[PDB]
């Protein structure tokens, strides 16, 4: 299980890595106005979210760049590029079921609510009648 343990350690290390990168972006873009202003750290929720999408969108462009240097010339020997495809086709296999299984609930629920509504229109009449006793 050499390669598998290697990949799992890769996962651990890269998780720590992306976490630290993310906060580092956060901490730097904090530090910036920390120094430019003197104490102004009252960035509002609306102000906080713009930073959020800016950082995610840079995270975006950095992750599409890899999709330019690993694909046009598929090595098929790169222990890492082989990891790409099998971890790239795997992503979208389950895409059909979620779309289908969300529809398989947004209808099932329409039957539940309808049967409950008839049970309501029924129970009320039944109590009215048992009171007509």
């Amino acid at each position: 299980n050499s390669s598998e343990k290697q990949w799992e350690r890769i996962q651990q290390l890269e998780k720590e890595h992306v976490e630290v990168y993310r906060e580092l972006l956060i901490t730097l873009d904090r530090l910036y106005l920390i120094r430019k202003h003197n104490h102004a750290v009252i960035l509002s929720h609306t102000q906080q979210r713009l930073l959020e999408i800016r950082h995610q969108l840079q995270i975006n462009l950095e992750k599409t760049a890899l999709l330019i240097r690993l694909l046009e010339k598929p090595d098929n020997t790169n222990v890492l590029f082989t990891k790409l495809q099998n971890l790239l086709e795997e992503s979208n296999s389950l895409d059909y079921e979620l779309l289908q299984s969300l529809g398989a609930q947004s209808s099932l629920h329409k039957q539940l609510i309808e049967s409950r509504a008839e049970r309501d229109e029924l129970m009320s009449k039944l109590i009215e009648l048992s009171s007509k006793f």
Binding site: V18, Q58, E72, I127
Partner: protein, 427 residues
């Protein structure tokens, strides 16, 4: 005696002489027992549905002794408890107030989850007023407890959120509590679009996945006609919109553009210079060129984020080539979500016409397309490849037209493109 009742005719005839026993634990828990299914329901009928009704106290006390983990088999009773309660407005709200606080969460976040999925979707609040605050507090509490230290995520907030969304469907379908639906709705969204759970690095789709259903709910509501509710309670708002259009699940963007197109017919009535249209056509003015004719440098504020941010980050972004970079990765052929899906489209399409050129890589991209278009020039020039293609834009319209035949969940994207592009409007 109720036990003596054997047939429906027995209950019909001996109705007034019937005696209500006190053997609730035997009547609720799972010939002479043919009507055990009705046993519980009829007892709420012999006497009026009062709070002190035997099965009410029975089931709520059962739920208590389930949360506190004294019951041998907690799972077995929940469906029973849901059943009588899922279709009882009175008993539901009592269990709601009794078990829908953060207080009753730290004991077991898993059983509250299931009973929520049972009771929550089927409910009409008795009093409209003192619930919105209640549920907002409740869900904020669940969020705080779910995204805490020492425990990243176990979909405890996302799926409970989804059940609340279900309940909001039940509400918005009825009237006079739709305002309670479409006001708790955006409040729940703004809780779903928090960075610690709605991520682009470690997303944990559960939020995003629950999010499309949420957006689908008012999309469903958007399609259905003849209803009075302020669109102000419909436009999801740029505060949480831009965080979705910048995500990386493809189907997130799919449901997003679905909601987008399924507002056009229900938005164009409002004036052009409109408080909320102004942000809608904003999503339009840009996302139309985040999958397509990428002129982000020519334009400004891609997602509200200034363009020259991309000027900066693109520099120091190393690329082996320098032929086309500025437009190299900003479309179907270059977004990180639906680019790899696009080469699967191209391959499965070439697999159909039994091509003999066999595109020898995968990324569709303005440069790598020119290579495969020139080094295999003449043979394709005769045939052996997709017919229409003469320029990359033709590959784009082709991958669209194929993406618009429903087997692929992402189908809504092509619909959005066709509806709002007006250049490829001829499909």
């Amino acid at each position: 005696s109720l036990w003596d009742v054997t047939s429906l005719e027995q209950l019909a005839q001996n109705w007034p002489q019937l005696h209500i026993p006190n053997d609730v634990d035997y009547m609720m828990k799972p010939s002479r027992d043919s009507l055990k299914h009705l046993y519980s329901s009829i007892i709420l009928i012999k006497n009026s549905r009062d709070e002190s009704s035997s099965p009410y106290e029975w089931c709520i006390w059962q739920l208590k002794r389930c949360f506190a983990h004294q019951i041998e088999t907690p799972q077995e009773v929940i469906p029973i408890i849901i059943s009588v309660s899922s279709m009882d407005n009175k008993l539901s709200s009592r269990i709601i107030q009794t078990f829908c606080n953060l207080k009753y969460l730290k004991l077991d976040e898993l059983t509250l989850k299931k009973v929520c999925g049972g009771i929550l979707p089927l409910w009409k609040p008795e009093l409209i007023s003192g619930t919105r605050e209640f549920f907002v507090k409740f869900m904020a509490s669940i969020f705080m407890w779910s995204t805490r230290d020492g425990h990243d995520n176990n979909c405890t907030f996302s799926e409970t959120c989804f059940y609340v969304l279900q309940m909001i469907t039940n509400w918005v379908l009825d009237d006079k509590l739709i305002a309670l639906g479409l006001t708790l709705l955006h409040d729940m969204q703004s809780l779903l679009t928090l960075d610690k759970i709605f991520n682009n690095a470690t997303s944990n789709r559960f939020s995003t996945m629950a999010f499309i259903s949420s957006l689908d709910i008012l999309t469903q509501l958007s399609k259905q006609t003849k209803s009075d509710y302020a669109i102000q309670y419909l436009i999801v708002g740029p505060d949480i919109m831009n965080k979705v259009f910048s995500s990386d699940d493809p189907l997130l963007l799919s449901a997003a553009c679905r909601y987008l197109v399924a507002t056009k017919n229900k938005l164009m009535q409002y004036p052009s210079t409109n408080k909320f249209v102004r942000m809608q056509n904003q999503y339009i003015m840009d996302l139309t060129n985040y999958l397509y004719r990428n002129k982000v440098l020519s334009s400004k504020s891609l997602f509200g984020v200034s363009p020259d941010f991309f000027k900066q980050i693109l520099e120091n972004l190393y690329i082996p080539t320098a032929d086309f970079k500025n437009a190299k990765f900003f479309t179907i052929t270059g977004i990180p979500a639906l680019s790899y899906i696009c080469i699967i489209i191209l391959r499965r399409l070439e697999t159909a016409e039994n091509t003999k050129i066999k595109f020898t890589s995968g990324i569709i991209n303005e440069e790598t397309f020119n290579n495969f278009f020139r080094v295999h020039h003449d043979e394709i020039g005769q045939h052996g490849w997709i017919k229409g293609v003469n320029n990359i834009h033709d590959l784009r319209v082709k991958i669209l037209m194929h993406l618009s035949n429903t087997a692929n969940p992402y189908r809504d994207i092509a619909a959005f493109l066709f509806t709002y592009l007006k250049s490829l409007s001829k499909y």
